[PDB]
């Protein structure tokens, strides 16, 4: 039922990559957006995608190693120590009802 995130790998090495997979993504979406941190907060938005559009629109948190996919997963390459901690996904479904989910990876 619930939208959940999975980090691949779970714990990351500095300079390598991590993949935030999305489980139980509901069909029928208007769009979704990825955030740095616990909260859905505009100024921490890494990127937003709309379902009809083909192109995704980055936000202030876009460092330039983030690749969003249209299965809602987020790849982050050349990870720094500053990438530690939480990442939050908000989905907006076709009826404008939102769902939330948080992810995290620990770098060493």
């Amino acid at each position: 039922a619930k939208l959940t995130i999975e980090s691949m790998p779970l714990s990351v090495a500095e300079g390598k990559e991590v993949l935030l997979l999305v489980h139980n993504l509901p069909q029928h979406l208007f769009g979704y957006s990825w955030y740095k941190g616990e909260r859905v907060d505009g100024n921490s938005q890494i990127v937003g995608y709309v379902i009809g559009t083909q192109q995704a629109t980055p936000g202030a948190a876009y460092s330039g190693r983030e690749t969003i996919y249209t299965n809602a997963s987020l790849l982050i390459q050349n990870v720094t120590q500053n990438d530690i901690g939480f990442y939050t996904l908000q989905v907006i479904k076709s009826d404008l009802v939102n769902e939330e989910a948080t992810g995290q990876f620990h770098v060493y």
């Binding site: 208007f30 629109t57 939102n98």
Partner: protein
């Protein structure tokens, strides 16, 4: 002869006086009115489903604005969203950028809402002014809300008029905003037939034909107004002192003769345009909106809240069927006067 020229000029001017300044007797008027009512109908039928409040500059300028509709009043929220548990969320459509095939900005929605309110209120408060009339000034009210650190309602005054030119501009704003930016539509939660329940359709995908028809109705209605002012400022003067060859010189008589033709050609094009506006109404009213736009008498969305629980969203409530018949009833009166009109143009062609 003089009695013949005077009979033709009187017929032109009698028909021109009705066509230009008449209300119920004028197909030029009823066509224009239909265009106006058709856009109100369009918005009343599918407006609530229009997704709005995408961001213009940044996701971190998170804005909302609620837009009020009075009746059994309702309110439409642009920007926000509804959480899983059912509470309202200040992060919603404003998390994603506004543009073509996505979502109207707050600024775009507030123009539709303003235009709709001006148009709605003008037709009720004062009706449509006659097409040759300069118009009657009137105040419109537009009620909106923002959120605070509490909700603040604000009702604006707009000094406007009910002349066709102004009212067509308001309608044009509504249709062209939809036609050009193609905002997505809200789906059903798993109500009209067109509102799917599956994914969520794009407004120009669902209503392309209807938007073009609605758009063409306005373009033709405006053309009616322009040919009507041509007509108004082109009234042939009756021949007095007919035997006077100095007063009624063949120069100012051929001037009158081709002044009469300009009057006739306006009337033709106006009636032709009015008949196109009816054709354009049939295009509008016979797709997805066939069972909706023409009628009036409990539907919802997650960005909508009603004062009671009734409201008239989903169907047109603009008296379009009533206006359609008035257009048909007025057009047959002019369609049977064509023998008199063709007698005058053939008589005019001599000089």
């Amino acid at each position: 002869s003089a009695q013949a020229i005077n009979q033709a000029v009187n017929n032109l001017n009698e028909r021109a006086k009705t066509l230009a300044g008449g209300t119920t007797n004028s197909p030029a008027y009823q066509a224009t009115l239909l265009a106006l009512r058709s856009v109100l109908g369009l918005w009343n039928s599918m407006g609530y489903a229009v997704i709005c409040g995408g961001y213009t500059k940044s996701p971190g300028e998170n804005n909302q604005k609620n837009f009020h509709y009075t009746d059994n009043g309702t309110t439409i929220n642009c920007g926000g969203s509804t959480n899983s548990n059912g509470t309202h969320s200040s992060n919603g459509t404003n998390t994603l950028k506004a543009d073509k095939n996505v979502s109207l900005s707050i600024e775009q929605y507030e123009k539709i809402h303003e235009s709709y309110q001006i148009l709605s209120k003008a037709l009720k408060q004062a009706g449509l002014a006659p097409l040759n009339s300069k118009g009657e000034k009137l105040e419109a009210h537009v009620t909106t809300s923002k959120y605070q650190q509490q909700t603040k309602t604000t009702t604006s005054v707009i000094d406007t008029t009910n002349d066709a030119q102004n009212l067509l501009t308001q309608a044009q704003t509504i249709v062209n905003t939809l036609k050009d930016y193609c905002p997505m539509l809200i789906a059903k939660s798993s109500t009209p037939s067109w509102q799917t329940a599956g994914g969520g359709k794009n407004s120009c995908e669902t209503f392309g034909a209807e938007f073009s028809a609605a758009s063409d109705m306005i373009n033709n209605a405006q053309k009616i107004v322009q040919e009507t002012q041509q007509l108004s400022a082109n009234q042939p003067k009756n021949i007095t002192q007919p035997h006077n060859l100095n007063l009624n010189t063949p120069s100012s008589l051929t001037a009158l003769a081709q002044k009469m033709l300009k009057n006739a050609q306006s009337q033709a094009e106006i009636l032709k345009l009015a008949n196109q506006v009816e054709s354009d109404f049939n295009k509008l009213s016979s797709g997805h909106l066939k069972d909706y736009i023409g009628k009036c008498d409990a539907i919802s969305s997650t960005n909508m809240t009603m004062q009671s629980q009734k409201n008239n969203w989903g169907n047109g409530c603009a008296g379009v069927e009533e206006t359609l018949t008035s257009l048909k009833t007025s057009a047959a009166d002019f369609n049977n006067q064509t023998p008199q009109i063709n007698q005058a143009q053939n008589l005019a062609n001599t000089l």
